[PDB]
Design a protein around this ligand. Sequence first.
Ligand SMILES: NC(=O)C1=CN([C@@H]2O[C@H](COP(=O)(O)OP(=O)(O)OC[C@H]3O[C@@H](n4cnc5c(N)ncnc54)[C@H](OP(=O)(O)O)[C@@H]3O)[C@@H](O)[C@H]2O)C=CC1
Ligand code: SF4
Ligand code: SF4
Ligand code: SF4
Ligand SMILES: [Zn+2]
Lengths: 140, 114, 123, 123, 317, 181, 117, 136, 239, 310
Amino acid sequence: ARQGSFWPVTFGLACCAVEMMHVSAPRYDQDRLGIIFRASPRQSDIMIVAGTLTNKMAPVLRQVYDQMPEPRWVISMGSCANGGGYYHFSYSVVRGCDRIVPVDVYVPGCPPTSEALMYGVFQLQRKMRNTKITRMWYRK
Amino acid sequence: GEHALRRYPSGEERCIACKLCEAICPALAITIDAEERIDGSRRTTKYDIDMTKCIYCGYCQESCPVDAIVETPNVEYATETREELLYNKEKLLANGDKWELELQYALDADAPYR
Amino acid sequence: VPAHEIVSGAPAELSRNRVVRIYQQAKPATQSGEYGTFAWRLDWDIVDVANRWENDLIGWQSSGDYMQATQMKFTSKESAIKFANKQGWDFYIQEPHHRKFRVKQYANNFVHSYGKLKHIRTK
Amino acid sequence: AIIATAFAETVKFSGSKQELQKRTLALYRQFLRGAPTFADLYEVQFSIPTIRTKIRQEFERHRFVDDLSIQNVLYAKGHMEYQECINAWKQQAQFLKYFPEEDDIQGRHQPSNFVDKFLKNRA
Amino acid sequence: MNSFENLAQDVNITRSGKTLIAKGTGGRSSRTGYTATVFGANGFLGSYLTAKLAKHGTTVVVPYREEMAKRHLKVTGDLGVVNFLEMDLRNLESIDEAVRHSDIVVNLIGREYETKNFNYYDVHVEGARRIAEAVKKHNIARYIHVSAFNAEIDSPSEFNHTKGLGEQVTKDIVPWATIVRPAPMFGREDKWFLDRMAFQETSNPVHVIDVAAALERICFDDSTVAQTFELYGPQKFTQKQIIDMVSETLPKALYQAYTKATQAIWWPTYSPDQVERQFLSQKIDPSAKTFNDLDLTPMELPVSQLENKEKTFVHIL
Amino acid sequence: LPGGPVPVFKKYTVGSKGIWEKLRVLLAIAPNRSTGNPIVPLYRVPTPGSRPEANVYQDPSSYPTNDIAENPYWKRDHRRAYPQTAFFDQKTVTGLLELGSEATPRIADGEAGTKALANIANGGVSFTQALGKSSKDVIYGEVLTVNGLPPVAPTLAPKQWKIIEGEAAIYPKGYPCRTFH
Amino acid sequence: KSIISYNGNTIEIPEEYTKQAPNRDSTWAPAQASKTEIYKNNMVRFEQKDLSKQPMPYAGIELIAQQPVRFVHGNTAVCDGANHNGPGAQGHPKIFINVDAPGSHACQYCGTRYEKE
Amino acid sequence: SSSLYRVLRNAWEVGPRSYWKQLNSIGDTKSGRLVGTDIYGNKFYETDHQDEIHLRTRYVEYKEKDYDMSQVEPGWHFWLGYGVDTAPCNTPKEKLPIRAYPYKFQPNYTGTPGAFVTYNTLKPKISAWEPVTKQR
Amino acid sequence: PSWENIKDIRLDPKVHVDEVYEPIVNPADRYLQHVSDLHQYAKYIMAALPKYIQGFSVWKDELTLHVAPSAVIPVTTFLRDNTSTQYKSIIDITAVDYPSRENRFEVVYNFLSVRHNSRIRLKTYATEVTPVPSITCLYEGANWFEREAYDMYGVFFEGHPDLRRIMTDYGFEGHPLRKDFPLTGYTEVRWDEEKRRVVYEPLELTQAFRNFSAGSTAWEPVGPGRDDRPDSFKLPTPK
Amino acid sequence: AVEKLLNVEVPLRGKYIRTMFGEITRVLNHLMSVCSHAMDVGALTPFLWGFEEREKLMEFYERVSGARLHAAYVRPGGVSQDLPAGLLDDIYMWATQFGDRLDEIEELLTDNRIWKLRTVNIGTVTAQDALNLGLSGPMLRGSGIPFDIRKNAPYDAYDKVDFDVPVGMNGDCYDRYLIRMAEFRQSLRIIEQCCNDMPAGAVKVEDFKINSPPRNLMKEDMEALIHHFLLYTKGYSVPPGETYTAIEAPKGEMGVYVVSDGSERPYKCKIRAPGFAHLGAFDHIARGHFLPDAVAIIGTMDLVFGEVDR
Ligand SMILES: NC(=O)C1=CN([C@@H]2O[C@H](COP(=O)(O)OP(=O)(O)OC[C@H]3O[C@@H](n4cnc5c(N)ncnc54)[C@H](OP(=O)(O)O)[C@@H]3O)[C@@H](O)[C@H]2O)C=CC1
Ligand code: SF4
Ligand code: SF4
Ligand code: SF4
Ligand SMILES: [Zn+2]
């Protein structure tokens, strides 16, 4: 259920957002995977930091991450979203959302190809395969 | 997509440590240290790319006279830690090993146009 | 001299602990060009703990000093001094060193030896 | 943008020192009137007289400045700061920039002497 | 700029013989040189402890049990500082492997309630047995063992009994263990405290950031070896006193029968030896060293005019 | 009408075949509309890494540049033949008003014309004094237009517009947008 | 293979992983950092990890030493290092090697040794 | 096409065994030609059928039930994405690159404990002194 | 009439040249006549406002009026309102610091006359402390531009409603586009777990910034170049 | 801007090829923003049809450059490299069907009465304050003023290509919509005229002191290896000067003001974004509108926010 329904709150603030809107395009469809953008963190399972993170928006990104319900993951789309990127040596930039949010999958690419973002989604669903929420309660 | 350090026919590292890919890189992702090895040949001791600050402009591939580093069309290498995403010399030599059959196909169609 | 260091936004640490140097860049012994030897550079002296250290991980040169890559160009020496004490900075200034003019002739190379030759030219 | 923000002021530069002293005291009154809405607005740990002692301390930083233009640039920066703080645009993480001292004790081993500055070479 | 406040100096040698040159200024991107293993870093104390530990660049090795929770400690350190590795307390090679490169090591493994796989005797005196076996084996300077307050063996309380048993075990095995007894612990969203609620026992609550601070202040000076410390707040409190402070800020046998009924669930039910600990109160060792040993003092637990101004506004446009 | 409606068999899109096309010409809005999907044997065959044109490619060139023998580079360099900004203060415009121009020299006495240059180079004259001293047909010759009018703000290539309003327009009449050409 | 872990601890790795490559055991540069050096420095993070799926990509200093030496009859030896099945300019820039001294003179781009005979 | 006739005739051509595995793998029904297989083991197919859209002609049937785009061999990976026409068993002796070492193909080990570790390729830049004492 | 029977265009006789012929010519030669026109126009404008126009520069198809700060509102008014000028649209205004000058910043103004299809530039100067007067009195689109020139450079615009910072952090102390401000800045951001907020710390990098500007040319790369000043607008040589 | 400072001229084929890839960029931009405006108003099928045409065009980008979204193709000397072997025959095959794929999107919006009523007197700007706010492109031509740069101050082989320009009459969101729906058509006219009139020749500028020699040459020529080595370590030097160069982006007039020291680094660069002046103009227009019509006016100034802050 956590895989076949898969709802991507997006905090992407630059260019990688259009590359995400190619995952909504009719060539690389996402709804055929079960993906839909519930555009409120109160109902999204996961977050996608798809774009840069400036120093003006790091508490805003944290406050959006705070509100989601507890079975929550986050994938980091792009190279500006992991380790600063192109804007790594800048005064107003966070060097990746690793400092703000605890991220599970990193999708690299400065425009990380819609191919590759979908592949990062499949990697996250594989991480959902072996989460073992009920075996863990058995103290494996 | 991702990066690869190619090799010659009969296996030689191709990277003559000319620092051109480091000098041109618009996001300062390349770092290289270079030493003369035992043969007297000029090679890199240390080659490194930060893939978190790489921007995929292809200038590092355009700049190399030997054509030692290239871009393989792999985009499916998404990771889970930042440490995995820092590629030293060994990961890039393993990439140029793995993708070499494919990079033949890429550079058979690209090399006149370059 | 008006004191602009309180309205620049720079911290007090930079104006009270860091000494800076005005210098004109030396003509390189490598090549015969002299183009980068006209502007007066402004450059910060290094901090000995904060300058550079090698990383745990890969061996990246990490630094906590942030003025290590900043360097200014000025047209004049008095321009650099006026800007440097206008921003409230401790500076040292380095005087340039030009070459002594010596007259050269090509006919110097083969003048007549009256006594011992004491030299053999090659050309 | 013909209509301006609520707590705006057309930026205007004073030729007299005393009318700028008038504007400075009016600004201090605005800050200290707004200290309780700053305490409610930014969800702070402590109580209102610490906001008030910080406003007074940030004004006693800049008391013996002589030059009238530098005091004009200082007054304009201060009114911009008031307008950001009162309009709830700054967030709590940047409101608490003003209080680096208060949040926590940063640890042991505060270097005071030359030697405990020397043992960690100023770290 | 930043500065190493946890360190007395730059160049620190450990007692095992390792030379440690700290690099750079203080802060995130620099390194102190120590390698630390915090057991139970998932825990309520351990999150703050390795937040304070990885703040300056101490390499922290954390052995985790579940991997879904541990993600919130990746944010705390630099890239390459915190190192997660999986551990069960049963597989003894995971225990002697997580402590293999530590030069300091901290245990906090202690559980409120017995469950199907663990009573209090295997979590508190035998897990501590196995960890101190490993530190015995591996020549680790500065073994630190955290316990409970009221930790004595003549106690009727099985928790307090086996925790005194646990320190018996870690004084048995390693002579140079520092051993630390904190008071009740108040902090942000603690498990059986402020959010559980927001009585004639008397015990001191201590803030957890200052038990973590005090713990780290133990961690780096070696004045602290083979001494046991008790960490108690400033003023002595009644439970009815505490909860009525909380109130203006915002039969025993069938009660035990009720907790019998409610334990057979996946949510963290109340332990029956916990009402037992309620009648017990804070009797602290006078021949121990408290907060003022390590230079800190702990934080203590403690209509008519708007109608007429409304008369000038507009309400219906 | 040169770019007007073309039928859908010149549009390179998979379309339809059989009596299903006879059904969809009755069930349509415009019958000359494609389906969107490109023709697979036509659109992108051969694939770009497999082209016979790649093995014959040579780098292109123009003749007076690739020429091996007759051009030197200094004749066809234009980066080092840049013009500079003609910076004019007010006293050189006073000099242009009082001494003259290289097209229009009002200077005799070359030996004394250097010292006549000199005091304006020192700041002897001022500019409104030069405007008062100067003739009316030098004011109407060099400062103003020869008819006495102010010069209009110059443009490089003037654009004369021509509104297309017939059925060569892009919207018929009744729509609030017009073709301007 | 046991190496001392800065404390008197000896940690044990298989000896197939203390080689620089499966071609050559020793190091080919004065600052090449031995595998015993690397594993002595940071094994805090090779814990719980397979040494098998590390790269191991085949040092070229001995893959160039087993190539035969070419023989030229003239005075100077031409080299580009291109392939001649590939449509384009691959290989290195074309350099000319003097072969006059006793021994084999190597190309400074590719390492193929040339000898006059 | 989006037809029922297409899924109908493809289900009849491929057979019910292969239909249930292609239904447990993809949503579509596809009739291929078996151009070749992978060194990892991944059968590839090319469809010549007339009612196909662009970018549907070529596909992979994997081996494992957890499949990756990462599990395809490099020379085949360029082919699946429509880079080359000729499959890497179809290309002649001249295109196959000369090597002096074996090929081993690691796909991707992300989350797997065989994930990559980065480290310093060289030794620390400034040496320290070996302690040597002397009795005077 | 089918998509089966449609012709291919890959099988076609294509264009083929033996050899391409492109004549070489200086790109600055196409401007010259208009550049002469521009010269005359500027010589008029300085003659029309002698109290306010210190200079002008014509490079190549681009006019720049050099005007003092207390002289900016009488000039812009003229440029908005004279029938010959009609520079209605504000385009882009900003600052550039030259730290070697007494007056550190110069403030440039770009205007477009959509009537006459022409652009103009207006340059004034400002020290770090002394202002420039604001043209938001005349142009309602100017103020955001002035405001950006405020935050990146610290230049003031007296008589400006809501001068404050824009496109920078709210508690940011410093003016970024300024030669004394370093590239990576002074501070950095992380999440403190103890305080449960982001904290702002003094800056520290895992890889230090390496500028390769050290290592520029030692030979001066371009000449002085030629002039395209017309013979109408340079001083006569005597005799 | 760097061409104007460098005083060099791009070849003929390099001009036509940047006309063509600046017009399919215009198609992609108008596609994305018209369908994004239709989505935030409430029509959601044009979003997906336009994004399929965007996939059809992003492949042309990936053929031409390497990457799909960010292409470093247009360079200060000219063009990065030559076209691939069979792309000119492919853009034609695309255009033949895009002509009707656009009329189809036009039908459920242009005379939709809900789409009409939502944008008829929304976002009205008068022609006199469209100049005072500094508005340009589709917002200035929404108000009746006949001005666009590729006709008025032409560049990059727009002289050689014949097309017309749509200009609205009332200053509203509806005429700003109609002129985009017509600029689609005009861009398609450019594309077929540029595929018909494509010449042969060099694609980069002629000399190797501002852009690199080809790899055929620098591996055998000593001069070309010297130039290749120096253009990548140091770069070329630009003569000292200043320029403001403005072209017409599909958002509006976009300019760059660059100050050249004479070094190989720019002394100063400034981007004048169209959307900065469009969002600065928001208060002047959105006074007295309802809250839903504050959303349809964002989708006519078309804020991508890479423009507004940088
Ligand atoms: N009132 C209080 O809070 C007091 C606490 N203490 C003691 O401090 C220590 C930590 O307290 P606190 O932080 O507040 O509460 P915790 O929730 O942290 O206690 C449990 C911690 O240890 C882990 N744990 C428990 N059992 C096991 C087990 N068999 N195997 C592996 N890990 C286990 C838990 O893992 P996981 O995170 O996955 O659940 C968790 O990290 C305990 O020893 C406690 O006795 C001292 C006095 C009073
Ligand atoms: S990751 Fe790349 S494409 Fe995405 S926003 Fe950053 S720079 Fe732009
Ligand atoms: S990869 Fe190329 S550019 Fe980089 S150092 Fe090696 S030869 Fe030089
Ligand atoms: S692709 Fe660009 S950013 Fe990446 S390493 Fe090469 S030159 Fe640097
Ligand atoms: Zn060679």
